Symmetry: C2
Subunit: 304 residues, 2 copies
């Protein structure tokens, strides 16, 4: 048994608040005495085409921001802009503030999203940062300000805040310092995401997962080289594999007794021949949103 | 965008504790001054083949149970057996006790699992109760006592506690009153799960989800009857559909303008013709672990 598993959400749930500016409601992240939220909260429908955020923020007073933490109305005592985030200084430190860090993740890494509406948690699920710096999330109107995170030991590492849906129906957002992942801007304009690619190291991790769960039909007696594998990779829009990827997969290799370059030969055959109506871990497609760390945690039982 | 989404786990996280009896550690659920856990915690390796739980529990003293809530060691002041659960009366009420209910769910319904090791949360994911009263979870050694739950409004409804893995690699467990779901016993013996079937109403809900997410290739101009659909259903090991199922799907029907019996004709074609290498919501197989309620929550944005 092997599932898409999210981190436990409790420590983030106690940080989620509602932020209203005019008729626009979305979510904020209440850490210590600062609420972080998307700066587009200050936009009117009209402003959203080509907003001058500097001029719009000058228009705003602390009293134009209605922040609720469940029942409590939090008084905003200061407002400032960092990149695409608004920091709303509030009169109360969050007593539910967990230990935390702000981190900028790499493309191919995974995180949990706590999807929120009206400052209330709705649900938690795992996402990857796509190589083209989009995410394939589940987000309705008013989900903006929902965050992505990892937990290490007892520390929440915030890596994502939700801002927008692209034409293609994928999602874009920032780190908690307000810098977009990828080329996107917080403007209601047609914006191209790059060509996306499949995260090869993650497909290999998931093939290792399949083998640990005794699902090993796709194994073949052959090996390959990074060099020769990367030829097929480029043909099927897979990211090239590096020795770093090979080193990262060592625990699953050593755990299974299958060399990385042997697994890579099995992947080559799957891309060329397809799956002949066979499934791997109850899927009819190659899965690329589990990192090697994700597989090790689910197949070794790491807790927080 | 449409994901397997778990409920937020915070309110359950504060209830999870470690329960050790000899060399056996698993998890317990600390509500008020009672810790609930699988009664097989009291078994030795040997006892597990054919345990006489009444005689084994008589052997045990409060002092044979080591219960930790994070740092705190909880003193057990009473022990009793209800069906397949142990209730360990402790000297401290859990100050983190949420509002809660114990519910016995129906086959075909979904719940969130907080997978735990050593009384520490590892992760949260959605499960269905299979028609054969098993669950396809992700659980390692020491995951016993992990619980499944739903949240309504502000109330946690506990419906599952994990006890065992079946030969097939699926999972079995009890309600929080200690009654197994299905024919299973807490004995380390070969036990047959029934033939499993596909949860038809859930596959229809997910086809509705696909249509809401504008993924509608599989729609055809035809209708059918419960009567005639149920002929194909029985042929492909799908549960029969009732008017109750039709009524349950009304919100998604009314939401989409597609009649239930029209969706049922599309499902008939998919079962007979397969998917021709096309995907629905980024899946190459028919998904049956989303209930109509699950689809409505993800596609209407219900919070807690």
């Amino acid at each position: 048994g092997f599932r898409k598993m999210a981190f436990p959400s409790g420590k983030v749930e106690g940080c989620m608040v509602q932020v209203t500016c005019g008729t626009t409601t979305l979510n904020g992240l209440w850490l210590d005495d600062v609420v972080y939220c998307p700066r587009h909260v200050i936009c009117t429908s009209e402003d959203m085409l080509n907003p001058n955020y500097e001029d719009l923020l000058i228009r705003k007073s602390n009293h134009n921001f209605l922040v609720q933490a469940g029942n409590v109305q939090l008084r905003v005592i200061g407002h400032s802009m960092q990149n695409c985030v608004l920091k709303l200084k509030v009169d109360t430190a969050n007593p539910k503030t967990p230990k935390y860090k702000f981190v900028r993740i790499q493309p191919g890494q995974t995180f949990s999203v706590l999807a929120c509406y009206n400052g209330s948690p709705s649900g938690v699920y795992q996402c990857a940062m796509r190589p083209n710096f989009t995410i394939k999330g589940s987000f309705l109107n008013g989900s903006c300000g929902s965050v992505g995170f990892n937990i290490d030991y007892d520390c929440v590492s915030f890596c994502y805040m939700h801002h927008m849906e692209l034409p293609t129906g994928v999602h874009a957002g920032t780190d908690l310092e307000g810098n977009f992942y990828g080329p996107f801007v917080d403007r209601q304009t047609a914006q191209a995401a790059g060509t996306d690619t499949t995260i090869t190291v993650n497909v290999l991790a998931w093939l290792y997962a399949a083998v640990i769960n005794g699902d090993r039909w796709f194994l073949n007696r052959f090996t390959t080289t990074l060099n020769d594998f990367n030829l097929v990779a480029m043909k099927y829009n897979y990211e090239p594999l590096t020795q770093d990827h090979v080193d990262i997969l060592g625990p699953l290799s050593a755990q299974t007794g299958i060399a990385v370059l042997d697994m890579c030969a099995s992947l080559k055959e799957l891309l060329q021949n397809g799956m002949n109506g066979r499934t791997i871990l109850g899927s009819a497609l190659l899965e690329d949103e589990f990192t090697p760390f994700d597989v090790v945690r689910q197949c070794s039982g790491v807790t927080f």
